[PDB]
């Protein structure tokens, strides 16, 4: 995972977004949404989804939200007041901590001004705090912008490292939830929905010579009288029940 001063973003698109797979990562610590319900995630289809990941202290997890301020919110990772999406965080001590302290995770402490939403700054340029140029010499009122966390096994709650993932949820949509389905019943009389084609009647064997690109057929009155089963690709002849 990336340091908070240099958070890592990747784009998500053209996929089936199963949001149940991420509830088996770790016990449970922080989870909150915004503009979306946790139980409607496996349904809504999004135009764009972005995953922003980083490592921070447990006590800093509260800063990753709309309307927050402190250190991380202002100098490392800022969310917009109208942020839409879900934030997931869990305790990663067992993987990230070290006996003398893991010093490979950095955050920005010295900064001229607050960051904009989803802005990043990867610069390590010397910060001038005073009214005189130090020309690179780290003396008085002259600082290296970044500091380390030094995560240790001996630290209590709030000082331990947490892995944070922010899923930003945003026209034609490409990131859709999964669909459920049941068994196919033949030669009876059922209600049915075939990949969006709703209707009622008896489903029987068909001898209609469908072309490779055709999904359903119609009678002389332009009414659907046959469908292709989306899983078996078989053709079902549809008639009214006796």
């Amino acid at each position, epitope marked *: 995972f990336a340091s908070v001063y240099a958070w890592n973003r990747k784009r998500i698109s053209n996929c089936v977004a199963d949001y149940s797979v991420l509830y088996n990562l770790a016990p449970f610590f922080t989870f909150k949404c915004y503009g979306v319900s946790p139980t409607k995630l496996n349904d809504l289809c999004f135009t764009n989804v972005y995953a922003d990941s980083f490592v921070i202290r447990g006590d800093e997890v509260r800063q990753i939200a709309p309307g927050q301020t402190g250190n991380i919110a202002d100098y490392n990772y800022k969310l917009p007041d109208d942020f839409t999406g879900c934030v997931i965080a869990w305790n990663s001590n067992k*993987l990230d*901590s*070290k*006996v*003398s302290g893991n010093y490979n995770y950095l955050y920005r402490l010295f900064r001229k001004s607050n960051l904009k939403p989803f802005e990043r700054d990867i610069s390590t340029e010397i910060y001038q705090a005073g009214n005189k140029p130090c020309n690179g010499v780290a003396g008085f009122n002259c600082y290296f912008p970044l500091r380390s966390y030094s995560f*240790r*096994p*001996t630290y209590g709650v709030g000082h331990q490292p947490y892995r944070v993932v922010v899923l930003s949820f945003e026209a034609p949509a490409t990131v859709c939830g999964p669909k459920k389905s049941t068994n196919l019943v033949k030669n009876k009389c059922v209600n049915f929905n075939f990949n969006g084609l709703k209707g009622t009647g008896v489903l029987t064997e068909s001898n209609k010579k469908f072309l490779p690109f055709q999904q359903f057929g119609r009678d002389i009155a332009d009414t659907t009288d046959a469908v292709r089963d989306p899983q078996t690709l078989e053709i079902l002849d549809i008639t009214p029940c006796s």
Partner: antibody, heavy 117, light 109 residues
Framework: ITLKESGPTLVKPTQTLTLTCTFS??????????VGWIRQPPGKALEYLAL???????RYSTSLKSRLTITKDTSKNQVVLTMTNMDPVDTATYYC???????????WGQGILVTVS | PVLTQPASVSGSPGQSITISCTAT?????????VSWYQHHPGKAPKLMIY???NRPSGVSNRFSGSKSGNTASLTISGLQAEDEADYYC?????????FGGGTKLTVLG
């Protein structure tokens, strides 16, 4: 998961002891996993010597920090610990073991007995 | 900054005994990563309990543990003659890891 130890069993005073741990069944280059060394002198408890992490971060016992050096070769699955300026009192059985956070050491090897004389 | 243990523990077979290990410093912090070992002479040390109370695979359910404050305890129920070994505790400190003095177990009979 197995770890085998080999090296000198007899060392002269002021000389350097080099022990090699060869492991298999796992990779060291993974998060949360390291390899360390522990020794047990006669009549005494286990003493921590050194630990090397998957990212080559090298840590040592504070009392032996200046005497121990630990390195690893990920191509042969081997970890090597060298201890300089061996004293007549540095007689112990050395052990190679896997280091994790929820469990400080596990999968301990049988160990190698080193005597200084 | 030393882990302190009793010189030995003893009791009748079939009964329960306790092996204790107490920290003497605040360098241990949360002291929530206590490991216990059963060392059989001539063999490698074996991990019996980790993270205070959890068992590794290949370990009998007769072995368990707990914590109170900055002191840890190893509980051995249904004591067997096969449990005669030197037991050790281990925990993290601010810049290193330590092992305890070691407790010698004796089974009466």
């Amino acid at each position: 998961i197995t770890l085998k130890e080999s090296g000198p069993t007899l060392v002269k005073p002021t000389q350097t002891l080099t022990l090699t741990c060869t492991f298999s069944g796992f990779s060291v280059t993974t998060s949360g996993v390291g390899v360390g060394w522990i020794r047990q002198p006669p009549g005494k408890a286990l003493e921590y010597l050194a630990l090397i992490y998957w990212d080559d971060d090298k840590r040592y016992s504070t009392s032996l920090k200046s005497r121990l050096t630990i390195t690893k070769d990920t191509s042969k699955n081997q970890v090597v610990l060298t201890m300089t300026n061996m004293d007549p009192v540095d007689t112990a059985t050395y052990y190679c073991a896997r280091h994790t956070i929820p469990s400080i050491f596990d999968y301990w090897g049988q160990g190698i007995l080193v005597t200084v004389s | 900054p030393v882990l302190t243990q009793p010189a030995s523990v003893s009791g009748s077979p079939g009964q329960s005994i306790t092996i204790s290990c107490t920290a003497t410093s605040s360098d241990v912090g949360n002291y929530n990563y206590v490991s216990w070992y059963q060392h059989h002479p001539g063999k490698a040390p074996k991990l019996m309990i980790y993270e205070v109370s959890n068992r590794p695979s290949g370990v009998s359910n007769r072995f368990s543990g707990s914590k109170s404050g900055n002191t840890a305890s190893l509980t051995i129920s249904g004591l067997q003659a096969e449990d005669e070994a030197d037991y050790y505790c281990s925990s993290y400190t601010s810049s290193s890891l330590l092992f305890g003095g070691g407790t010698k177990l004796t089974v009466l009979g």
